[PDB]
From Swiss-Prot, chain A:
A GO biological process held by the record: mitochondrial translation
Top-level taxon: Eukaryota
Family assignment from sequence similarity: Belongs to the mitochondrion-specific ribosomal protein mS42 family.
Subunit annotation: Component of the mitochondrial small ribosomal subunit (mt-SSU). Mature yeast 74S mitochondrial ribosomes consist of a small (37S) and a large (54S) subunit. The 37S small subunit contains a 15S ribosomal RNA (15S mt-rRNA) and 34 different proteins. The 54S large subunit contains a 21S rRNA (21S mt-rRNA) and 46 different proteins. mS42 forms a heterodimer with mS43, building a large protuberance adjacent to the mRNA channel exit in the mt-SSU body.
GO cellular component: cytoplasm; mitochondrial inner membrane; mitochondrial small ribosomal subunit; mitochondrion
Species for this entry: Saccharomyces cerevisiae (strain ATCC 204508 / S288c) (Baker's yeast)
GO molecular function: metal ion binding; structural constituent of ribosome; superoxide dismutase activity
Described function: Component of the mitochondrial ribosome (mitoribosome), a dedicated translation machinery responsible for the synthesis of mitochondrial genome-encoded proteins, including at least some of the essential transmembrane subunits of the mitochondrial respiratory chain. The mitoribosomes are attached to the mitochondrial inner membrane and translation products are cotranslationally integrated into the membrane.
Name of this protein: Small ribosomal subunit protein mS42
UniProt keyword 4Fe-4S present: no
Curated annotation (Swiss-Prot), chain C:
Top-level taxonomic group: Eukaryota
Subunit composition and interactions: Component of the mitochondrial small ribosomal subunit (mt-SSU). Mature yeast 74S mitochondrial ribosomes consist of a small (37S) and a large (54S) subunit. The 37S small subunit contains a 15S ribosomal RNA (15S mt-rRNA) and 34 different proteins. The 54S large subunit contains a 21S rRNA (21S mt-rRNA) and 46 different proteins.
Gene behind the chain: MRP4
Function text: Component of the mitochondrial ribosome (mitoribosome), a dedicated translation machinery responsible for the synthesis of mitochondrial genome-encoded proteins, including at least some of the essential transmembrane subunits of the mitochondrial respiratory chain. The mitoribosomes are attached to the mitochondrial inner membrane and translation products are cotranslationally integrated into the membrane.
Family statement: Belongs to the universal ribosomal protein uS2 family.
Subcellular location as annotated: Mitochondrion
TM annotation in the entry: none
Keywords of this entry: Mitochondrion, Ribonucleoprotein, Ribosomal protein, Transit peptide
Disulfide bonds: none
Lineage: Eukaryota, Fungi, Dikarya, Ascomycota, Saccharomycotina
Position of the signal peptide: none
Name this polypeptide is given: Small ribosomal subunit protein uS2m
GO cellular component, one term: mitochondrial inner membrane
Swiss-Prot record, chain D:
Taxonomy of the source species: Eukaryota, Fungi, Dikarya, Ascomycota, Saccharomycotina
Protein name: Small ribosomal subunit protein mS37
Pfam families given in the database record: CHCH
Subcellular location: Mitochondrion; Mitochondrion matrix
GO cellular component: mitochondrial inner membrane; mitochondrial small ribosomal subunit
Note: Present with 259 molecules/cell in log phase SD medium.
InterPro entries: CHCH, Ribosomal_mS37_fun
Gene designation per UniProt: MRP10
GO biological process: mitochondrial translation
Similarity remark: Belongs to the mitochondrion-specific ribosomal protein mS37 family.
From Swiss-Prot, chain E:
Full-sequence range covered: 90 to 244 of 247
The family this protein is said to belong to: Belongs to the universal ribosomal protein uS7 family.
Single GO MF annotation: rRNA binding
Cellular component aspect of the GO annotation: mitochondrial inner membrane; mitochondrial small ribosomal subunit; mitochondrion; ribosome
Annotated transmembrane regions: none
Role this protein plays: Component of the mitochondrial ribosome (mitoribosome), a dedicated translation machinery responsible for the synthesis of mitochondrial genome-encoded proteins, including at least some of the essential transmembrane subunits of the mitochondrial respiratory chain. The mitoribosomes are attached to the mitochondrial inner membrane and translation products are cotranslationally integrated into the membrane.
Quaternary structure, from the entry: Component of the mitochondrial small ribosomal subunit (mt-SSU). Mature yeast 74S mitochondrial ribosomes consist of a small (37S) and a large (54S) subunit. The 37S small subunit contains a 15S ribosomal RNA (15S mt-rRNA) and 34 different proteins. The 54S large subunit contains a 21S rRNA (21S mt-rRNA) and 46 different proteins.
Gene giving rise to this polypeptide: RSM7
Other noteworthy facts: Present with 1340 molecules/cell in log phase SD medium.
Primary localisation category: mitochondrion
Protein name as annotated: Small ribosomal subunit protein uS7m
UniProt keyword annotation of Ribonucleoprotein present: yes
Source species, domain of life: Eukaryota
A Gene Ontology BP annotation from the UniProt entry: mitochondrial translation
Keywords: Mitochondrion, Ribonucleoprotein, Ribosomal protein, Transit peptide
Length: 244, 96, 266, 84, 146
């Protein structure tokens, strides 16, 4: 069975939610109900199988390349993502970005400030994620921090399942060429499962699902919610997520 | 002198007791001062082999302390009756 | 922490070793995020977290497969009283009796370890080495898993007489005293022999009988119960069942050892 | 019907038969000689065979069962003998 | 390593190692040789091939190799089953036939006799073709016993 993790200061979380982002009934919707819903579904989709012994991160890595297990992958992704996000907005387990994080921002985002990159993240989430998705600030193997936007339950770890492009609507030739290159690179792998190496790891994660903002913000105003999230990150966690 | 380490310069019941204490942890003092051996049968058996008849000495002995402990032992030696009786005494103490 | 590693330069990417350490940092912190796993069997935990004898239920013996006996065509009828019935062409072992015998044998192991006696764990089937080694190491005991040399007890001088021996104090602390050749040459007989596969270890059982060593064994549907002092009816063919019973006995021995050290520290 | 055997001193095959793979050289030679018998000697219709023959016999003109081991290893386990 | 020597090694990466000797010519000369007088055998062979070149004006070594490949029988019946022959055995048979033919000629010098025999063979005039045909015919007749 997969069980929802116990959070630090759960009583305060149930009484007053997360200050400056979520009310009590908002955090209950996004964690104490959504995470329970996802863990129950994952348990029902993996019980009596090998995957029941693995953590959601390992499940999503194992099932990422198998088309028919996509539903499990989705669950295993959202669960994982939903705890990456909650963990880095929890009040505590005044935190400030580390020198290393800001140094890597200056070395990645054209020597820009952190607030400018925050505004870029607001813009990226506003445009490239129609409906449900996730916003990430991720570190590649090149020590480069970049902004990644996944639709629905795409993962930041494995690029063939990023789901960063909405193919329901029209796409630019640049995006199509990107997809073609990624398809060729996937075909380049020799492993019979057809998997590839991808060392991208998430530094910051924001939940753009309606379970996070809809109750407290409204149908619009997701930009306000994302702004509140990024202005009130738990920088102890975010600083620990960067390799020293 | 050039005595090798582990060598000594230059009765049977004593050697039986020492060997059996080393091999089985039984008390040597009891064996030496409270057991009496009595040979029961002493035979020459023989085996026919392609190179002639090979004779062996066979000894069946009994040992005991006259206090409810008794043991039979058999020993066999192609060289001497002393050796067959020694092995029989050994076996008898082991079978107490 | 990680000596003789040369970091990379900020201009250049992560190296393979830097990537390894980076994903280790990820693994210990964030890889386990999302859900905690409950009520799922992990094979290693039978060895490192065996339960106490008092906490064992029939259900946990059954989940380990201890109840699954030999084919009814290979029945040794002297094991009749241990059997619960037959199901799917095999005999089922009565796990109530298994639990009672297991608690008795565990108490014997605990008592012998508490008295500072020597405990030997014998199992010569394929993948039993890990459990035997861990049982020995947590009981301050001894084990064999490769092969039982016939005569290891009844011919100890010719076999085990050459290997080294050691004087130890009440706390099992090496004294590093020099032993005499006579002391080194003596037999050092186990105080308790526990055999995981007694059917393939008749030599050891007979030697223990001759050498007068009490013995514990896992007795399957084809094994002779009277050849051991303290039988445990159970499946001797499954590594899970064998490791469950062995871990129980090893923990009982560990508790006996802990009690001995406790009073020797008071 | 099942015919169980009594306890045997052994379980051994007297002369185990093995996989004697045929030599490619001899097969090529037979095909070439058949070709010469049918289509005439030094016929061009199977010069390829000649070439292949020349290629295969060039350096060398010519280009054990384990049943008893496993039978001896497993006999005691599978013989279905009653317990002692 | 220096760059010039790295370049040399790169250049030789692709080149195959040259052969120490021509195995076929080595075999033929060793078949001519007696009493370890190799230089004399090599002189005889090279002089015969010189005559072959001078009368045909082609690479005499290639002509010799074509001659030996064509004249030698591919298989032979032995005690009666056909058996295939390897290249060395074929060259031995063909060379023995060639020497027997050459020793029917008039010159006192063996090099001249051998050279003009090899010239005649290079122009498709040799009685040993009949020997090859007879051997092949026997092999065909006994193909059933392979
Ligand atoms: Mg069994």
């Amino acid at each position: 069975i997969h069980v929802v993790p116990k959070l630090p200061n759960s009583k305060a979380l149930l009484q007053n939610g997360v200050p400056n982002i979520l009310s009590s009934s908002g955090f209950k919707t996004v964690w104490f109900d959504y995470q329970r819903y996802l863990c129950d579904k994952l348990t029902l989709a993996t019980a009596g199988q090998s995957l029941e012994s693995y953590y959601p991160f390992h499940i999503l890595l194992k099932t990422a390349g198998n088309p028919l297990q996509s539903n499990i992958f989705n669950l295993a992704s959202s669960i994982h993502n939903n705890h990456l996000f909650v963990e880095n907005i929890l009040p505590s387990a005044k935190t400030e970005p580390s020198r290393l994080f800001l140094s890597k921002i200056k070395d990645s985002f054209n020597g820009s400030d952190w607030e400018v990159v925050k505004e870029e993240m607001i813009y990226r989430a506003e445009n490239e994620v129609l409906g449900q998705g996730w916003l990430f600030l991720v570190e590649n193997n090149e020590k480069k921090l970049f902004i990644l936007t996944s639709n629905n339950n795409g993962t930041p770890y494995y690029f063939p399942r990023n789901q960063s492009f909405d193919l329901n609507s029209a796409i630019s030739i640049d995006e199509f060429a990107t997809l073609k290159q990624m398809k060729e690179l996937i075909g380049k792998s020799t492993k019979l499962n057809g998997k590839v190496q991808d060392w991208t790891m998430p530094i910051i994660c924001v939940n753009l699902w309606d379970h996070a903002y809809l109750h407290d913000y409204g149908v619009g105003n997701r930009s306000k919610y994302v702004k509140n999230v990024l202005d009130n990150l738990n920088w102890s966690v975010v600083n620990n997520r960067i390799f020293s | 002198n050039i005595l090798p380490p582990g060598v000594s310069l230059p009765s049977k019941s004593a050697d039986v007791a020492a060997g059996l204490h080393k091999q089985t942890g039984v008390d040597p003092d009891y064996i030496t001062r409270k057991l009496t051996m009595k040979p029961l049968v002493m035979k020459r058996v023989s085996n026919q082999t392609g190179k002639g008849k090979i004779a062996s000495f066979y000894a069946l002995v009994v040992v005991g302390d006259k206090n409810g402990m008794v043991g039979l032992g058999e020993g066999k030696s192609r060289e001497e009756m002393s050796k067959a009786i020694f092995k029989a005494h050994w076996d008898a103490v082991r079978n107490l | 922490p990680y000596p003789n590693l040369i970091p990379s330069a900020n201009d250049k990417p992560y190296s393979s070793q830097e990537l390894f350490l980076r994903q280790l940092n990820h693994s210990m912190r964030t890889a386990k995020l999302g859900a905690t796993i409950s009520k799922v069997y992990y094979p290693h935990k039978d060895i490192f977290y065996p339960p106490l004898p008092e906490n064992i239920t029939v259900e946990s013996l059954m989940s380990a497969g201890v109840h699954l006996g030999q084919s009814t065509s290979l029945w040794r009828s002297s094991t009749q009283s241990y059997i619960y019935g037959e199901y799917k062409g095999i005999h089922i072992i009565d796990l109530n009796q298994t639990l009672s015998y297991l608690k008795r044998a565990a108490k014997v192991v605990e008592g012998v370890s508490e008295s500072g006696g020597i405990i030997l764990f014998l199992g010569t089937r394929q993948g039993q080495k890990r459990g035997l080694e861990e049982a020995a190491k947590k009981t301050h005991g001894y084990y064999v898993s490769t092969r039982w040399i016939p005569g290891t007890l009844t011919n100890s001088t010719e076999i085990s007489g050459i290997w080294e021996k050691q004087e130890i104090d009440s706390n099992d602390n090496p004294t590093e005293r020099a032993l005499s050749p006579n002391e080194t040459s003596k037999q050092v007989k186990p105080d308790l022999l526990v055999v995981l596969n007694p059917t393939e270890n008749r030599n050891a059982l007979l030697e223990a009988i001759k050498s007068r060593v009490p013995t514990i064994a896992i007795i399957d549907t084809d094994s002779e119960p009277s050849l051991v002092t303290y039988p445990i009816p159970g499946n001797d063919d499954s590594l899970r069942s064998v490791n469950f019973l062995l871990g129980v006995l090893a923990r009982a021995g560990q508790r006996g050892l802990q009690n001995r050290l406790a009073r020797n520290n008071e | 019907p099942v015919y169980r055997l009594p306890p045997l001193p052994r379980l051994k095959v007297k002369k185990p038969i093995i996989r004697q793979e045929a030599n490619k050289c001899l097969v090529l030679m037979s095909n070439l000689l058949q070709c010469w018998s049918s289509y005439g000697h030094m016929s061009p219709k199977c010069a390829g065979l000649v070439t292949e023959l020349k290629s295969c016999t060039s350096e060398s003109a010519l280009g054990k069962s384990n049943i008893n081991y496993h039978a001896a290893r497993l006999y005691d386990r599978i013989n279905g003998k009653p317990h002692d | 390593p220096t760059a010039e020597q790295l370049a040399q090694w790169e250049a030789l990466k692709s080149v195959p190692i040259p052969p120490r000797k021509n195995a076929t010519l080595d075999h033929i000369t060793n078949m001519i040789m007696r009493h370890g007088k190799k230089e004399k055998a090599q002189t005889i062979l090279s002089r015969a091939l010189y005559l072959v070149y001078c009368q045909t004006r082609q690479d005499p070594i290639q002509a010799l190799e074509k001659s030996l490949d064509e004249l030698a029988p591919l298989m032979m019946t032995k005690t009666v089953i056909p058996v295939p022959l390897n290249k060395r055995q074929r060259n031995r048979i063909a060379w023995n036939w060639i020497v027997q033919s050459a020793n029917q000629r008039v010159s006192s010098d063996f090099a001249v006799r051998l050279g003009e025999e090899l010239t005649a063979i290079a122009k498709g005039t040799s009685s040993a073709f009949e020997k090859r045909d007879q051997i092949h015919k026997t092999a065909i007749a006994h193909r059933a016993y392979i």
